[PDB]
Design a protein around this ligand. Structure first.
Ligand code: MG
Ligand code: MG
Ligand code: MG
Ligand code: MG
Ligand code: MG
Ligand code: MG
Ligand code: MG
Ligand code: MG
Ligand code: MG
Ligand code: MG
Ligand code: MG
Ligand code: MG
Ligand code: MG
Ligand code: MG
Ligand code: MG
Lengths: 60, 141, 168, 53, 143, 70, 206, 55, 145
RNA sequence: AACCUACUAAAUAGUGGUGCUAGCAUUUGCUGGUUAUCCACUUCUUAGAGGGACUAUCGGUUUCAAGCCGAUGGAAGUUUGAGGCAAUAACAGGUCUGUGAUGCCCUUAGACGUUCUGGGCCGCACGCGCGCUACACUGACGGAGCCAGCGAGUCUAACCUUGGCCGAGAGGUCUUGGUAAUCUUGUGAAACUCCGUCGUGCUGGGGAUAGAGCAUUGUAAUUAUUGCUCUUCAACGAGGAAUUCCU
């Protein structure tokens, strides 16, 4: 079951919601975004949010 | 000194460390030739890398390997992988890149996990059985 | 001396275990809440984290004298290779151990079950808490067993943050 | 004086006990801790053993 | 060329050292040969009867040559086989310290092994000598 | 106890005359010709190798394989 | 073939085979094609191997059972009967003896004969137990390639075990005897009998 | 350990583990600095031990 | 080894020590079908007799046979370890015997007889017909006797 | 648990050079010995800090949504594989035979306290359950090869035990290293591999039962603690109805 919890999709929502300048179709750049732009307590979670901010960006 | 590299090969837990120097062309394991190694039925297993790349590829280099841990099959897969990751490590550092990619290409196209170390591992037996998944026995009543 | 480090470290946990036990049994009427042992050269040190060090101290420095002597005699320290130091704790509203023995000291002092539980939760909460919980299991007066729960605010129940935030 | 009130207690289960509760049965002996499994779990945190895996 | 015993496959080598120790005649075969049973984990004495003490010697030789220093108890363990306790599971158990120690002796007497320092038996100069010789003899059988 | 733990001279020369047309000869092949026991069938497999008839294209224990002369 | 040596020696026919043709233990993978339509893709042959012992993950996905060297599928399905769980070296060797025995009788690439026995023993269709109202009648159903391969191998190794059990021959003789007699359906072997009867009962209830 | 006090129930086992970490550093120093750097850097729960001698 | 020929020198079956022995079997293992004679004892004697093992029971010259009979029923004379014998220390005269053939039957009794006549608990139990070695009898042994 | 030829290092981990040295070839070489005779290094090992995966890349399927499927890639793509944790309520589930946790009841000196002696929980017509060994030739048997990881080990003591002799074995005895990555110990385990012997015969498969003897633990071994040696050589020739576990 590779479904992303509500907090994942929610944090990705609010990112693309107010930082569409910055963010592209890259994971790592989005990742390094999250590091300097977000307060995620763990690497795993932050990469979750990044790969989903990645998928939502690449389809919008 | 001479141009020389070192590599390894892991399987389950058996690690085979392998040294590849600028050498007359010997291929000894632990301290005995590769024409031993037995298992025997698994002889061609570690023969493989030499026949997959051409016997002449070793005439300019010496090949030493030692195995520890693991079992029999475990150590057999450990040396062959160590040998093959070694041949490509020397072509990495000393001859030329295109020759190095000719080797990876000529290995992986057949392979058997010759450059890539397998990741399989034992799963912890949990309580309630004599295995990891093998639960014990019940008879209801 | 001369003990395997394993058997050393284990024994040190047993040391503390027996220690806190004895304090828990001997300084309850003071909201005692835990101990820490500082190994040094020349001396072996013991701090008595309680809320009420003016009773543990005793008249011109007794009782602490008695507790030392006690603890000394038992583990066989040479008079002066052990040191005991009482200490107030920071607002006893965030120690599980302090409030439990308060509740104990509420109902043992004849008070309503809900007044005790609820008042306790209102203090601990007031003491800058994220959340507080109290379970009363047993039987009051009524023959049949019963139990109650008394939560307030926010707590988590699972995972590592347990090892991070909740005191039980 | 009274040469009639004890007898060998130098091995087996009856020689030792529990440093907490005197209980001979269920004794965990490892690492020279010598405390019974029913006691050991109530204290293991206070001692130093904790639950990771 | 230059030859070691590691450059010779175990089974041909030891069969050669055996037939050589038999051609040699000089041995020291304690006497309780054939009447004894190698290990308690064993069911029948070796079927070689007249011999097999040669085989175990060359086994002892080859293995000590190959390494640092080893003692009696180390060989008893090496020469150990599973012990079918009948209706109970198998479990490994050690071999006879008499047999192994009298091989290390009946070879220390013939000068292939020497009571090493630290401990245990250590390969002798005449040992390395003779072994590498017949090892080369073994490879000469194949030429 | 069901015969075939001996030699009976007439059997020897049977073993001489009967091993053409034998693409396969091993322990169970000698047995199945209603004769030699498993101890003395291996004596056959080793002595037919003294000269001609059989050609070792196999190896070892439990498993043998020979072919007729060429 | 251009001889080469360096230091530690490498034998004659050893260098001679390996660098040249990448043939089997010492058998030819050139030629040999699956004598039946279908079954291909599900029977290997190319790319070839030396000995049928592979550390390959044929389990972590649905159809990866397919890209396994067929001869090694035979070896794997030999090592069972409980006692011989694992013990891959044991079966592998008997496989070698097997192939030499097939090669001894009636010529042929003995690996090709193994294909001749696998193709010829996979039943074309079978009976499945449909309800149809308590009383479970039998529906003839056309069985897939993969099952056709698997069932043949299981059938071939099982009835060969029945053969080698309690009689003088060895696993290799009987197994070779099964592959040979089932190279072309002789109905003097276990697998051809069971195939033909499964096709008899599948035609029965139609 | 079995999780239950008694014996009733499906047999639940419970591994506890405690983790020891040991580490030694070697220093070449006289007597003043050793005593100075060893009397302080005190840490209750990290067991300090100072051995000497080349034997 | 080598193929042999022979004529009619070996006759199958042969009877020694009141027991009958199948010829045409490996002699090491023909001796075993006699009471008190096991693989270890048979083999040690065959070794002490200077008789070839590769031969079968069926061959073996009459002198080799009488050499077998003689060695077995006199052990420590022809040098055999004394611990190698079943009945060491007898029980009255203390001589190391190795009771053979129809004799071990007479001795199992002689022993059992001794224990009952003594009345200790191993006898009592041999008379009740139970197991002596202390094994449990709640569950095991049902057909039994 | 998997990945780091990137990072700090380590005579309690290891590598290459080097001398001192053994052996075989001699034409350079090959294969070992050498807790300090040095010099270098950290790929192997060790745990510190980080990195790495977010089911990515592309393509299918699906309301072009969540997702799923396929390939390439990858240390790894079934929640990465394995576990630790775990809400709310429920049972009159178990535990007063873990507790100096406890209410009430019972007994409290001819004790239901406690200790000392000996027996007993093992008692055996049978029933039910977890199992262990087997019916053999993918085998027993005998030589030979010889390969792991999780642990634990002696202070105010006798633990883990190398080694040297003695003994067939079990063992004994003389010494030693180790409060430990250092010593036991590379835990040289076992199936397994190899060369044989036996050859389908309740056979050399099997080892129940049974006798006689030696040993070890212990104050004590009888109703036999265990260990070993010889001999005795049962049932069992694959198991009815049923039924456990597993990707
Ligand atoms: Mg949460
Ligand atoms: Mg969770
Ligand atoms: Mg007393
Ligand atoms: Mg207890
Ligand atoms: Mg052995
Ligand atoms: Mg007998
Ligand atoms: Mg590293
Ligand atoms: Mg891939
Ligand atoms: Mg109830
Ligand atoms: Mg009570
Ligand atoms: Mg009472
Ligand atoms: Mg009981
Ligand atoms: Mg047997
Ligand atoms: Mg064997
Ligand atoms: Mg029998």
């Amino acid at each position: 079951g590779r479904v992303r919890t509500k907090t994942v999709k929610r944090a990705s929502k609010a990112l693309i919601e107010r930082y569409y300048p910055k963010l592209t179709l890259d994971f790592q750049t989005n990742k390094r975004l999250c590091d300097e732009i977000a307060t995620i307590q763990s690497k795993r979670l932050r990469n979750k949010i990044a790969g989903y901010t990645t998928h939502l960006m690449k389809r919008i | 000194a001479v141009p020389s590299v070192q590599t390894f090969g892991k399987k389950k837990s058996a690690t085979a460390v392998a040294h590849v120097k600028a050498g007359k062309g010997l291929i000894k394991v632990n301290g005995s030739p590769i024409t031993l190694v037995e298992p025997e039925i698994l002889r061609f297993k570690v023969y493989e890398p030499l026949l997959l790349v051409g016997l002449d590829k070793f005439s300019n280099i010496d090949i030493r390997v030692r195995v520890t841990g693991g079992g029999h099959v475990s150590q057999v897969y450990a040396i062959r992988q160590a040998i093959a990751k070694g041949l490509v490590a020397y072509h990495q550092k000393y001859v030329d890149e295109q020759s190095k990619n000719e080797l990876k290409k000529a290995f992986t196209s057949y392979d058997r996990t010759l450059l890539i170390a397998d990741s399989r591992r034992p799963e912890p037996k949990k309580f309630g059985g004599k295995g990891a998944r093998s639960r014990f026995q019940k008879s209801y009543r | 001396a001369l003990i395997s480090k394993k058997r050393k470290l284990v024994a040190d946990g047993v040391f503390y275990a027996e220690l806190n036990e004895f304090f828990t049994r001997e300084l309850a009427e003071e909201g005692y809440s835990g101990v820490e042992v500082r190994v040094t050269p020349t001396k072996t040190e013991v701090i008595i984290r309680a809320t009420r060090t003016q009773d543990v101290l005793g008249e011109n420095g007794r009782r602490i004298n008695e507790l030392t002597l006690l603890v000394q005699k038992r583990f066989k320290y040479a008079p002066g290779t052990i040191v005991l130091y009482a200490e107030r704790v920071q607002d006893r509203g965030l120690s599980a151990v302090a409030q439990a023995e308060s509740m104990k000291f509420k109902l043992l002092n004849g008070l309503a079950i809900r007044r005790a539980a609820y008042g306790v939760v209102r203090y601990v909460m007031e003491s800058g808490a994220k959340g507080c919980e109290v379970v009363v299991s047993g039987k009051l007066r009524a023959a049949r067993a019963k139990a109650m729960k008394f939560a307030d605010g926010f707590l988590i129940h699972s995972g590592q943050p347990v090892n991070d935030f909740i005191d039980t | 004086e009274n040469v009639w009130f004890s007898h060998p207690r130098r091995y087996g289960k009856g020689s030792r006990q529990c440093r907490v509760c005197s209980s001979h049965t269920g004794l965990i002996r490892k690492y020279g801790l010598n405390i019974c499994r029913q006691c050991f779990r109530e204290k293991a945190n206070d001692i130093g053993f904790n639950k990771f895996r | 060329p230059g030859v070691s015993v590691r450059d010779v496959a175990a089974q041909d080598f030891i069969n050669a050292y055996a037939s050589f120790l038999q051609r040699q005649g000089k041995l020291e075969v304690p006497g309780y040969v054939d009447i004894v049973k190698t290990s308690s984990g064993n069911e029948m004495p070796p079927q070689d009867a007249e011999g097999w003490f040669y085989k175990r010697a060359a086994s002892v030789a080859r293995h000590i040559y190959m390494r640092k220093q080893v003692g009696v108890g180390k060989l008893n363990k090496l020469y150990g086989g599973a012990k079918s306790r009948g209706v109970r599971p198998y479990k490994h158990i050690d071999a006879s310290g008499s047999i192994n120690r009298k091989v290390l002796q009946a070879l220390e007497k013939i000068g292939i092994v020497e009571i090493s320092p630290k401990g245990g038996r250590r390969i002798s100069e005449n040992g390395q000598r003779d072994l590498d010789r017949i090892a080369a003899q073994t490879l000469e059988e194949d030429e | 106890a069901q015969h075939a733990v001996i030699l009976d001279q007439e059997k020897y020369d049977r073993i001489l005359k009967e091993v053409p047309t034998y693409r396969y000869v091993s322990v169970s092949v000698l047995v199945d010709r209603l004769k030699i026991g498993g101890s003395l069938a291996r004596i056959a497999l080793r002595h037919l190798e003294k000269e001609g008839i059989i050609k070792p294209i196999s190896k070892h224990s439990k498993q043998a394989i020979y072919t007729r002369a060429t | 073939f251009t001889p080469v040596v360096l230091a530690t020696p490498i034998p004659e026919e050893v260098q001679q085979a390996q660098t040249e043709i990448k043939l089997f233990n010492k058998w030819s993978f050139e030629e040999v094609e699956v004598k039946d339509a279908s079954l291909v893709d599900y029977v290997q042959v190319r790319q070839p191997i030396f000995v049928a012992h592979t550390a390959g993950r044929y389990a972590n996905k649905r159809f990866r059972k397919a890209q396994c060297p067929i001869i090694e599928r035979l070896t794997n399905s030999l090592m069972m009967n409980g006692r011989n769980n694992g013990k891959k070296l044991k079966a592998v060797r008997i496989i070698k003896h097997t192939l030499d025995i097939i090669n001894v009788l009636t010529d042929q690439n003995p690996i090709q004969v193994v294909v001749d026995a696998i193709t010829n023993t996979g039943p074309r269709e079978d009976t499945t137990r449909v309800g149809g109202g308590g009383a479970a009648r039998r529906q003839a159903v056309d069985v897939s390639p993969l099952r056709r391969v698997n069932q043949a191998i299981a059938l071939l190794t099982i009835g060969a075990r029945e053969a080698a059990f309690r009689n003088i021959k060895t696993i290799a003789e009987t197994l070779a005897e099964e592959l040979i007699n089932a190279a072309k359906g002789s109905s003097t072997s276990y697998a051809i009998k069971k195939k033909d009867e499964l096709e008899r009962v599948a035609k029965s209830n139609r | 350990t079995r999780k239950t006090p008694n014996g009733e129930g499906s047999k639940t086992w419970e591994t506890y583990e405690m983790r020891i970490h040991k580490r030694y550093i070697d220093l070449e120093a006289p007597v003043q600095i050793v005593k100075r750097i060893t009397q302080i850097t005190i840490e209750p729960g990290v067991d300090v031990e100072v051995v000497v001698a080349s034997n | 080894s080598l193929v042999v020929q022979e004529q009619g020198s070996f006759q199958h079956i042969l009877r020694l020590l009141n027991t009958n022995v199948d010829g045409n079997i490996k002699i090491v293992y023909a001796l075993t079908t006699i009471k008190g004679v096991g693989r270890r004892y048979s083999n040690l004697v065959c070794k002490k007799a200077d008789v070839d093992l590769h031969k079968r029971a069926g061959e073996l010259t009459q002198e080799e046979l009488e050499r077998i009979v003689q060695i077995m029923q006199n052990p420590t004379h022809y040098k055999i370890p004394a611990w190698f014998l079943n009945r060491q220390n007898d029980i009255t005269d203390g001589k190391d015997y190795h009771t053979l053939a129809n004799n071990v039957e007479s001795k199992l009794r002689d022993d059992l007889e001794r224990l009952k006549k003594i009345r200790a608990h191993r006898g009592i139990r041999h008379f009740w017909g139970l197991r002596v070695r202390g094994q449990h009898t709640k569950t095991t042994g049902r057909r039994r006797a």
